[PDB]
Write a protein that binds this ligand. Structure first.
Ligand SMILES: Cc1cc2nc3c(=O)[nH]c(=O)nc-3n(C[C@H](O)[C@H](O)[C@H](O)COP(=O)(O)O)c2cc1C
Ligand SMILES: Cc1cc2nc3c(=O)[nH]c(=O)nc-3n(C[C@H](O)[C@H](O)[C@H](O)COP(=O)(O)O)c2cc1C
Ligand SMILES: [Ca+2]
Ligand SMILES: [Ca+2]
Ligand SMILES: [Ca+2]
Ligand SMILES: [Ca+2]
Ligand SMILES: [Cl-]
Ligand SMILES: [Cl-]
Ligand code: NA
Ligand code: NA
Ligand code: NA
Ligand code: NA
Lengths: 175, 175
């Protein structure tokens, strides 16, 4: 498949988003992988990567992703298209809201990743986040199953539609 | 007092150890501070520091210490003597046992700290630790209240006695 979805998850929320995204892109278009069982080679096997990472323990990367970080740093993302997604709690962790999105961005961006999927901070109620691209945009899709679960369906659909356009899955696959 | 004990604690175990140490050394020899309520100056004020830090979320520094790290990195430890102590769970986190001891050591040692208080790994059963000083010594006192609470009383007493000798408290005060 042209797209490789790699995720990390402790309670299943980001695991579910990864599967919602694949279901929307079609399993023929996207492969789903748990970073916990993944290799450096798995990521290098795709030129379009969708990385899902929730934030835990006050601004930390999900443990499995944290374990993989030294390996991710060895990869060259120059020539690769990457979109980011992850979950967080904007009420209990208002000052660490989806920080991991910025942490992983800090790894793949300097290494060449062409990132697509920036998402507006509008509609969210948080105080601080390391996962911002600019003043009013997260660097990727921020999902909150604890405080705004009612908005997940709508959020995933538009973001997937959005990144398909930015990735041009229309042309790459058939045009 | 000449000795400043700075601890960070989530469930109070490291706080407990900090108080045992102060009590054994005597309040007139050591002060106790919670890192979450301390400033850069609070630490700089001492030439003998005992830093207590438990390891959480798979090898991560206790959240308050983690928040303080940037500040800790801008402290000159040249001329200061330091001892490290902390808690961990060697069974549920055998691959990350007391990793935070190594993490804080990695910050202070390059910044000139003279570390005392290395502790033998004998009697502990874990798979990996970033808190090692060498093959068979942790860089500081490792306490396990979850799996080896029956060893805590003696471990602390012996370690306090050890660093007292290493620090030369018998002389430093009036000899
Ligand atoms: C102990 C704990 C700490 C958390 N820390 C953070 C945090 O620092 N920042 C954040 O945005 N959300 C935080 N969260 C919320 C989680 O990221 C959220 O529940 C998410 O949906 C988990 O995704 P997962 O199932 O993929 O692991 C934390 C959750 C718990 C229970
Ligand atoms: C969810 C969780 C994660 C933990 N992660 C680690 C770890 O990575 N390494 C370790 O040695 N101990 C780990 N522990 C054990 C704690 O460090 C230990 O219980 C310690 O006594 C807590 O000290 P505190 O009370 O000062 O915060 C963890 C405990 C829990 C509940
Ligand atoms: Ca943190
Ligand atoms: Ca609501
Ligand atoms: Ca970790
Ligand atoms: Ca006890
Ligand atoms: Cl992190
Ligand atoms: Cl850390
Ligand atoms: Na694999
Ligand atoms: Na491929
Ligand atoms: Na951190
Ligand atoms: Na880490």
């Amino acid at each position: 498949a042209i797209t490789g979805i790699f995720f990390g998850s402790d309670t299943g929320n980001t695991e579910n988003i990864a599967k919602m995204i694949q279901k929307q892109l079609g399993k023929d278009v996207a492969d789903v992988h748990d970073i916990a069982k993944s290799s450096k080679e798995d990521l290098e096997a795709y030129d379009i990567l969708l990385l899902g990472i929730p934030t835990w323990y006050y601004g930390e990367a999900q443990c499995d992703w944290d374990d993989f970080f030294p390996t991710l740093e060895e990869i060259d993302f120059n020539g690769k298209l990457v979109a980011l997604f992850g979950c967080g709690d904007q009420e209990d962790y208002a000052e660490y809201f989806c920080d991991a999105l910025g942490t992983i961005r800090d790894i793949i961006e300097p290494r060449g990743a062409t990132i697509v999927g920036h998402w507006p901070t509008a509609g969210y109620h948080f105080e601080a986040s390391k996962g911002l691209a600019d003043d009013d945009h997260f660097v990727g899709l921020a999902i909150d199953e604890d405080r705004q679960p009612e908005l997940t369906a709508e959020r995933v659909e538009k973001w997937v539609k959005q990144i398909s356009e930015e990735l041009h899955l229309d042309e790459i696959l058939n045009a």
